[PDB]
From a paper:
The IM component LptB2FG comprises an ATP-binding cassette (ABC) transporter, which powers the transport of LPS across the bridge. The cytoplasmic LptB dimer binds and hydrolyses ATP and the transmembrane (TM) domains of LptF and LptG create a cavity to accommodate LPS. LptB2 constitutes the cytoplasmic NBD dimer and the six TM helices of LptF and LptG (F_TM1-TM6 and G_TM1-TM6) constitute two TMDs that are arranged to form a central cavity with two surface gaps between TM1F and TM5G and TM1G and TM5F termed as lateral gates. To understand the mechanisms of how LptB2FGC recognises and acts to transport LPS, we obtained high-resolution cryo-electron microscopy (cryo-EM) structures of LptB2FGC complexed with substrate LPS or ATP analogue β-γ-imidoadenosine 5′-triphosphate (AMP-PNP).
The cryo-EM structure of sfLptB2FGC was determined to 3.1 Å resolution. However, due to possible flexibility, we are unable to see clear density for the periplasmic domain of LptC. In our structure, residues M1, R5, I9, L12, V16, M19 and N23 from the TM helix of LptC interact with residues Q293, L300, L305, L304, L307, L311 and T314 from the TM5 of LptF, respectively. In contrast, only G21 from the TM helix of LptC interacts with V36 of TM1 of LptG. Comparing to the sfLptB2FG LPS-bound structure, the presence of the TM helix of LptC makes the lateral gate TM1G/TM5F of sfLptB2FGC structure much widely opened, along with the neighbouring TM2 and TM3 of LptG and TM4 and TM6 of LptF moved outward, resulting an enlarged central cavity. In contrast to the two recent publications, a density for LPS is identified in the cavity of sfLptB2FGC with all features visible as in the sfLptB2FG structure except the inner core of the LPS. Interestingly, the LPS molecule trapped in the cavity of sfLptB2FGC is about 7.3 Å away from that of sfLptB2FG structure referring to the position of the 1′-phosphate group. The LPS molecule in the sfLptB2FGC structure positions in proximity to LptG with kinked acyl tails rather than drooped as seen in the sfLptB2FG structure. In the cavity of sfLptB2FGC, we can also see that hydrophobic residues L17 and M24 from the TM helix of LptC interact with the bound LPS, suggesting that the TM helix of LptC is also involved in LPS recognition. The number of residues from the TM helices of LptF and LptG that have been shown to interact with LPS in the enlarged cavity of sfLptB2FGC are greatly reduced compared to the structure of sfLptB2FG.
Residue numbers in the entry:
A (entry chain A): 2 to 240
B (entry chain F): 2 to 133, 247 to 353
C (entry chain C): 1 to 24
D (entry chain G): 6 to 39, 51 to 138, 246 to 260, 268 to 360
E (entry chain B): 2 to 239
């Protein structure tokens, strides 16, 4: 599938913080969405997820317009959202986290969910923990059960909001390993992190926006050899 | 400059409590006096003037309360906004916070001393005549030198409580980020409320002749003033 | 939040409930 | 299942707030010495009847507000759940609450309060069935029937109201602001019960619907905060 | 000067969060304090500042023990602190909140307060904002006012707490320009943050404290070639 936005715009009060941002996420593709802080890279992200309602855009998965829909009707078309906070179900079991969202899908019978859950929790190596709740799990499983749980809702276009976001450089390699595995199952993923050193090292395309709109949409080695990004953003030294 | 900043910032929060708390006390004055005029006197000519003439009695309790609560709002805001930590980091003690609280309690204790004599007895020498010995609501301060239930000890302690409740809020408005910002008001708001439940049950209980309101009404005023000083001088050697 | 800050709010609010029951 | 997890989180904090609000007003109800008279122990199920529409609002603001500050209220609706079937999961735990404030307001709080007032012998508040077909020979004694028959209806309104401004303007506030709002809107419900109680007979003419205005006016705020502001 | 912190310790409810960390910083020397988020670098930093009281240890600023002193008493004797978040005075002018901490210095006369304030605007390129108060100030212009008024208190050893904290990479050139400007004025800067790649480019040496005690120190070249650091931290850094 392909998830495309088209001419997205958003204005709070007079100043249009987003004008004419158009992106495209295909399947089997990490794509980044970057830029300076407050420029509108986090508003044009939430306009694709569904929290911030659009003003002039057209969010389209391959043959249905979802630009009018809220987040919960958008999450059933195949959009998955992973927030940058913890958001694990705390006083609920780590097997019941997967069974929580596997009962929402009406195309699974009541026994066909308890082997899909038994399959997801060994792909992500979270089978040795089965009754550990989640208010004290780890920092390393406050990032891997939530990916197994966001994959249990059957997405096509899982959207990562600030995945790295203040973790040690020994744990960046682990959450880069499960982003590249995430698209080996045929799954386009959109990243919007601030730490632009690994979200240009994990992605294949990037979508630099600054203060209202797109600047570049090339490969990471095409934005370093650019010039206009190098004045509002990265600088003159990045190698 | 930093003292004129703390005074101008609390005064804008103190005059905003005095408008919210005036309507809260007006409605409590409106909930009751219907119930004494729905099966009592007629509510046709008095219900708007009996409301407006009981104001200098209810301003005896909201003038110490708005300076108390206005300093919990203002000092508690600058603790969370990291303006008081960086005030100590440039180097100046907590005596600036105490010299800005007592220069602001003087502004309130000369409104609560105009209200307590010849603005308070006036509204009882006018509210009790429109209904046509041992009263102690219309006598002024010089003619309150009678015997036998002369309660001027509750008209003096409403002015001393402007000063001892401005000393206690400078070390009790320290916001801990783990507890929160309303959980940190709980040892302060319970301590002011315990002060008014003891002095009210010493003014009325000392009105019958069970215990004289000079020994026991100023023991509470001196226990709480000595509590205001050990709290303000806690940063020293252990004792 | 502490052991001495918690045991103040228990003790100080116990004396408020007694003093509400005094003047009723 | 997490229809049984929203409801389990709410029901635990309703009964934690209600036990708190009854133990607080039981030490205040230790006034009647001013030594082992247990007048305040047999008057417990009357205090449960009085504080139950307030523990419903404050306990569901406290239980849904901890689902929102732990960010597990957006992560289940970003994987499924409509905002209607999370509203239907706080009503499925409201039916055992309504079937408890009318099961002790007719079987326990009659016989517990009366056997305490007789033990302390050194609006004719009896029952919803005892006052039914009692007074015939308009007045005041029928308003105590209507403000008691759908007093269980005021529990389900306040749990709907405690959800209407969790989706509205208290999703991103600290936890202490939700408690202060829960106490402040428990003051307005006292005002609407004792100022629309008398005044709807003596300065106006609602016969039956005068007891509805406490619950009917907090239902209009609930559908104004999730529909007009959506 | 030679601010030295010796044998520091803390226990939060029995949990030993730091044991035996010894760090020094001299005048005109950037020194970093980094490591993983295991309590470590943050509680050690908040002992030298003074907003966390030590359990056992000694803080001396070159001659005298200041370990039992609060934050406002250490600020008279050198040590100056910058919080991580926005700490500018809110409804005060930029010239006014530079003068508000310049008024407390009693070793100046009232004309020398005005000469020092106009010397600090032109040093930090602020003098075009002297009547403009804050919240008309951006993220990069609020930061220069906080360093200009921490320098109005006349400190030795400005120690910064996460001075990058989320800024775009054209705005780390300008923070590292005014950090290396404090070193050229004879100030011993002590930095802690999360960003490893931008402090090991600016520090002259760095302490790595992980899991309680101090695990390594040295110049940032020989930090990268260390093997015991390389396991718990910086797997394949560069
Ligand atoms: C957003 C803003 C909105 C506007 C806000 C501002 C305006 C508000 C306007 C109305 C204000 C009050 C007006 C008034 O005027 O209040 C007056 C007196 C002035 C009161 C001002 C009080 C409120 C705060 C003002 C400031 C607010 C910012 C009395 C009255 O008017 O009543 C007087 C009446 N007493 C009271 O009611 C208790 C009387 C007690 C008064 C104390 C006064 C000193 C208070 C210091 C407070 C400091 C607060 C910080 O407090 C009351 O009223 C209080 C009623 C409201 C309680 C609200 C909840 C509080 C707890 C919240 C949770 C912590 C008194 O005793 C008879 C004696 C009780 O033992 O027996 C009764 O029944 P029973 O035993 O027969 O069954 C009483 C029994 O006990 C009891 O229920 C048990 C307890 O005690 C109850 C104590 C109160 C609740 C405590 C809960 C724990 C609290 C812990 C707090 C730390 N039961 C009732 O009455 C039935 C009511 O359902 C009780 C309702 C209680 C609240 C919850 C339920 C709400 C309704 C139902 C919802 C489903 O006899 C008087 C003469 O008649 C002969 C009579 O009249 P009068 O004054 O004319 O003489
Ligand atoms: C028993 C009677 C009924 C009420 C029971 C309420 C039980 C509430 C429990 C929970 C609580 C509520 C806030 C309280 C604020 C002070 C409230 C004072 C009310 C005085 C009437 C205490 C939690 O505080 C919270 O603060 C926030 C950061 O803001 C923290 O993040 C939370 O993690 C938590 O720490
Ligand atoms: C008409 C009903 C009104 C109900 C109460 C509405 C909320 C009142 C409290 C919230 C507004 C005041 O409080 C502030 O809100 C913003 C909202 O982004 C928070 O952020 C702040 O941390 C909080 O301090
Ligand atoms: C009926 C329930 C009412 C709850 C009211 C909560 C009010 C919180 C006000 C917070 C606030 C404070 C204290 C405040 O001091 C302030 O500005 C100086 C604000 O500015 C926008 C505030 O919002
Ligand atoms: C600190 C707890 C209350 C926080 C309210 C938001 C605080 C952060 C932004 C504040 C702010 C505003 C709004 C502002 O409008 C302004 O103008 C000069 C400030 O100046 C320095 C500010 O600090």
């Amino acid at each position: 599938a392909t998830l495309t936005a088209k001419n997205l715009a958003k204005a709070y009060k007079g100043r249009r913080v987003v004008e004419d941002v158009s992106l495209t996420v295909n399947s089997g593709e990490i794509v980044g969405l970057l830029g300076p802080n407050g420029a509108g890279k986090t508003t044009t992200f939430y306009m694709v997820v569904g929290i911030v309602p659009r003003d002039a855009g057209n969010i389209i998965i391959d043959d249905d317009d979802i630009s009018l829909l809220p987040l919960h009707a958008r999450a059933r078309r195949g959009i998955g959202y992973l927030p940058q906070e913890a958001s694990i179900f705390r006083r609920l079991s780590v097997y019941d986290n997967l069974m929580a969202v596997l009962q929402i899908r009406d195309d699974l019978s009541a026994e066909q969910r308890e082997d899909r859950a038994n399959e997801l929790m060994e792909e992500f190596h979270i089978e040795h923990l089965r009754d550990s709740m989640g208010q004290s799990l780890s920092g390393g499983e406050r990032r891997r059960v939530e990916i197994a749980r966001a994959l249990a809702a059957n997405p096509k276009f899982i959207l990562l909001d600030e995945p790295f976001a203040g973790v040690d450089p020994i744990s960046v390699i682990d959450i880069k390993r499960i982003i590249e595995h995430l698209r080996d199952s045929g799954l386009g993923v959109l990243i919007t992190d601030h730490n632009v050193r690994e979200t240009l090292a994990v992605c294949e395309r990037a979508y630099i926006v600054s203060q209202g709109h797109l600047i570049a949409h090339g490969t990471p080695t095409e934005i370093l050899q650019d010039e206009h990004v190098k004045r509002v953003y990265l600088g003159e030294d990045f190698r | 400059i930093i003292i004129r900043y703390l005074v101008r910032e609390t005064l804008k929060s103190q005059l905003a409590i005095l408008f919210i708390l005036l309507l809260i006390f007006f409605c409590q004055k409106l909930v009751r006096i219907l119930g004494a005029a729905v099966d009592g006197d007629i509510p046709a000519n008095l219900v708007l003037s009996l409301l407006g003439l009981g104001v200098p009695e209810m301003a005896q309790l909201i003038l110490p309360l708005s300076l108390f609560l206005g300093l919990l709002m203002t000092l508690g805001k600058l603790y969370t906004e990291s303006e008081i930590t960086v005030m100590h980091a440039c180097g100046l003690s907590k005596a600036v916070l105490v010299k800005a609280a007592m220069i602001l309690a003087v502004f309130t204790a000369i409104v609560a001393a105009v209200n307590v004599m010849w603005a308070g007895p006036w509204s009882s020498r006018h509210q009790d005549e429109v209904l046509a010995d041992q009263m102690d609501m219309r006598t002024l301060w010089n003619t309150d030198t009678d015997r036998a239930r002369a309660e001027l000890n509750w008209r003096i302690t409403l002015v001393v409580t402007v000063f001892m409740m401005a000393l206690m809020v400078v070390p009790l408005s320290v916001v801990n980020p783990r507890q929160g910002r309303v959980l940190s008001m709980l040892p302060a708001m319970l301590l002011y409320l315990l002060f008014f439940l003891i002095q009210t049950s010493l003014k009325s209980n000392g009105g019958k002749g069970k215990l004289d309101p000079t020994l026991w009404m100023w023991t509470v005023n001196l226990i709480y003033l000595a509590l205001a000083i050990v709290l303000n001088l806690w940063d020293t050697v252990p004792v | 939040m502490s052991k001495a800050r918690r045991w103040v709010i228990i003790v100080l609010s116990l004396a408020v409930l007694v003093m509400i029951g005094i003047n009723m | 299942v997490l229809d049984r997890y929203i409801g389990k989180t709410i029901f635990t904090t309703i009964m934690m707030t209600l036990f708190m609000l009854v133990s607080l007003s039981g030490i205040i109800k230790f006034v009647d010495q001013l030594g082992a008279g247990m007048y305040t122990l047999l008057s417990v199920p009357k205090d449960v009847q009085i504080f139950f529409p307030m523990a419903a609002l404050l306990g569901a603001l406290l239980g849904l507000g901890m689902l929102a500050q732990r960010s597990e209220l957006v992560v289940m609706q970003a994987s499924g759940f409509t905002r209607m079937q999370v509203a239907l999961s706080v009503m499925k735990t409201a039916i055992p609450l309504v079937l408890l404030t009318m099961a002790i307001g007719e079987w326990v709080a009659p016989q517990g309060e009366q056997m305490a007032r007789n033990y302390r012998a050194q609006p004719d508040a009896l029952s919803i069935s005892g006052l039914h077909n009692y007074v015939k020979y308009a007045g005041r004694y029928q308003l105590n029937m209507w403000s008691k028959i759908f007093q269980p209806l005021s529990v389900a309104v306040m749990m709907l109201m405690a959800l209407s401004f969790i989706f509205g303007p208290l999703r991103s506030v600290p936890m202490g602001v939700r408690v202060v709002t829960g106490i402040s809107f428990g003051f307005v419900f006292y005002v609407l019960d004792q100022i629309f109680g008398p005044l709807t007979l003596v300065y106006g003419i609602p016969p039956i619907i005068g007891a509805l205005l406490p619950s009917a006016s907090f239902f209009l705020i609930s559908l104004w905060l999730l529909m007009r502001k959506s």
